[PDB]
């Protein structure tokens, strides 16, 4: 009925703290080819639920993914759910060819079997990815400990008692970045700094604290620290930097020394809505010393544009050939060895203007004769390395985009520029 997967990569989603109100899952595996305005990608999402001890299934459909046209994709189909499950799901594009499936966990997405059961626990989320070459990439994010869904906890109790600042916080590719200048009465060598963040919106309540605890000793300038936010984790975790613009050694009483606190909470979903509230509680301490607890709040808005290029990491390499016999060898991919059941290497000319013409250069372990890829000889030689050989060149700086993948490997992509 459904599709068969090729080169599946499964993840293990681990929730930290509790659920803020959304369900974010990042997928950095799927390939987003560089220098291609004609590279689309169909994506269907299958989600497995557990209502009352009996398994369920929810099929989504996001359609084609135009990389250079739209960032946030809202699903346009639903075959296993409730009344309008297509407003409960967001498919966001981060930088460097990574998506982020977000689902609000305070409103039920499916109800087909029973009506008054609130034991719906999400166990695994599966995402399909249709390649331009026809490859069927898959991802299987499985919950370590599946958390149940508590819906509609009456969240709109927004309140306003915290010193307000005129600056705003921006969230680009789910990543918030704010720079708050503040003043602390203590010096740098006596301050035990500590910060907490809390974002309130329509139904979301995120809480960010620094896992390091209180700052041991505030060194003069650029004090870095990792911060942990409530919800579902992410690589390149949240961070913060308190750079002290104060050459203080023996502080004089009353003088408020200026500090610069820059916060970057990583897992910030879009369901907070525009003009959301972001609280920041900072406080220095010691032997019950100065630096009393303060608070600064500011509006947080979401950037609709992608703050990067969706193209994945690509190693650029030049080939200064002569004549027309230009050759290049593709090394092994990261997580693979000689024992690999299926290995695929694909290539296409830079800036392809046709779909059914340029994407014919595919090579597997049991293949090597491309259907309609001309003047490109692909040989899968020994040493588990591939050998590309381009014929028919000269005085034309053609560029080739090569991409290799294996079973349990991370798909990589090279860019070779044939000059001279």
């Amino acid at each position, epitope marked *: 009925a459904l599709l068969v997967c090729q080169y599946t990569i499964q993840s293990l989603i681990h929730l930290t703290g509790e659920d803020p109100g959304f369900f974010n899952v990042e997928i950095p595996e799927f390939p987003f080819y560089p220098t291609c305005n004609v590279c689309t990608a169909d994506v269907n999402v299958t989600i497995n639920f557990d209502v009352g001890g009996k398994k369920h299934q929810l099929d989504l459909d996001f359609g084609q993914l135009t990389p250079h046209t739209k960032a946030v994709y809202q699903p346009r189909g639903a075959f296993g759910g409730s009344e309008n499950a297509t407003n409960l799901f967001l498919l966001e594009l981060l930088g460097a060819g990574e998506l982020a499936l977000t689902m609000r966990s305070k409103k039920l997405p499916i109800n087909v079997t029973t009506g008054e059961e609130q034991q719906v626990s999400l166990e695994s989320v599966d995402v399909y990815f249709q390649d331009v070459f026809g490859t069927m990439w898959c991802h299987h994010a499985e919950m370590q400990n599946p958390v149940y869904l508590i819906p509609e906890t009456v969240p709109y109790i927004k309140w306003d008692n915290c010193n307000s600042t005129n600056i705003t916080a921006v969230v680009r590719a789910q990543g918030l970045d704010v720079t708050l200048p503040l003043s602390l009465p203590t010096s740098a060598q006596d301050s035990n700094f500590s910060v907490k963040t809390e974002m309130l919106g329509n139904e979301i309540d995120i809480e960010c*604290i620094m896992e390091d605890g209180e700052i041991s000793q505030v060194l003069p300038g650029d004090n870095k620290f990792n911060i942990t936010c409530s919800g579902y984790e992410s690589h390149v975790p949240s961070g913060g930097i308190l750079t002290s613009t104060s050459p203080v050694a023996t502080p004089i009483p009353g003088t408020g020394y200026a500090y610069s606190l820059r916060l970057t909470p990583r897992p910030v979903s879009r369901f907070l809505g525009n003009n959301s509230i972001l609280y920041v509680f900072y406080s220095g301490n010691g032997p019950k010393a100065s630096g009393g*607890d303060y608070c600064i709040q500011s509006n947080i808005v979401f950037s609709d544009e992608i703050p990067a290029s969706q193209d994945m990491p690509t190693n650029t390499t030049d080939i200064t050939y002569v004549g027309d016999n230009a050759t290049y060898s593709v090394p092994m991919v990261t997580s693979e060895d000689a024992n690999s059941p299926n290995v695929t290497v694909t290539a296409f000319w830079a800036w392809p203007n046709n779909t059914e013409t340029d994407f014919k250069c595919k090579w597997t372990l049991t293949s090597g004769t491309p259907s309609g890829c001309e003047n490109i000889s692909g040989a899968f030689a020994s040493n588990r390395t591939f050998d590309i050989t381009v014929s028919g060149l000269g005085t034309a700086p053609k560029t080739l985009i090569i991409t290799r993948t294996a079973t349990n490997a991370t798909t990589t992509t090279h860019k070779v520029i044939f000059s001279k």
Partner: antibody
Amino acid sequence: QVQLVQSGAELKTPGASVKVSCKASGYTFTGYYIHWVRQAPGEGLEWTGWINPNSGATRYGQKFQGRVTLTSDTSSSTVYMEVSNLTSDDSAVYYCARELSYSIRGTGPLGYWGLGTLVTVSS
Amino acid sequence: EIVLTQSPGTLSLSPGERATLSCRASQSVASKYLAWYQQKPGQAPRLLIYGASSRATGIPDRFSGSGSGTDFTLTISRLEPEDFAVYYCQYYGSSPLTFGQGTKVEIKR
């Protein structure tokens, strides 16, 4: 500077209707978590519940089976507690505490403790 | 839900020596989510140790903390008549916050 001024010395009826104030001062009442730890004369401390004064996020112990109601107003830095049910063995000293520092959804250790409020259920 | 069992219960030691109070957890509790408290008769409790080893500001040096996995112990090294209080071990971080049964320490005279 931290102050948890608990209020009340309550002799309450078998059918419960009780409330304790627990004034708070000396810090940002919004940023810290306030817990309530009951102690009956039975050789033990037991945690009842906590509340976030920023979002109103309240959580209660599972032994109570839903008998507690913990609310808070932010205009006056107080956290009101109600344990109104069919109180059989709920004669204990209810302490109002505040976490040592910030924590993600009520996982800070209690560093600041209140005077304590002794309620006694009897007919 | 997690259960904590405090072994000693009552020490009744001399005025000054190491009192090793133990507290065992049923599950593999995180090495930072355990606490220790001191409640003197009539007063309220006060934080003694917060990160399982971290000592709270103001606490004396005699109060040492140890523990990992499920075996956690607090060592009062130098005893004195001002340590008659009852000490508890707490767990925070999961939804049900768990306390200990307590251990009344008595000073000789």
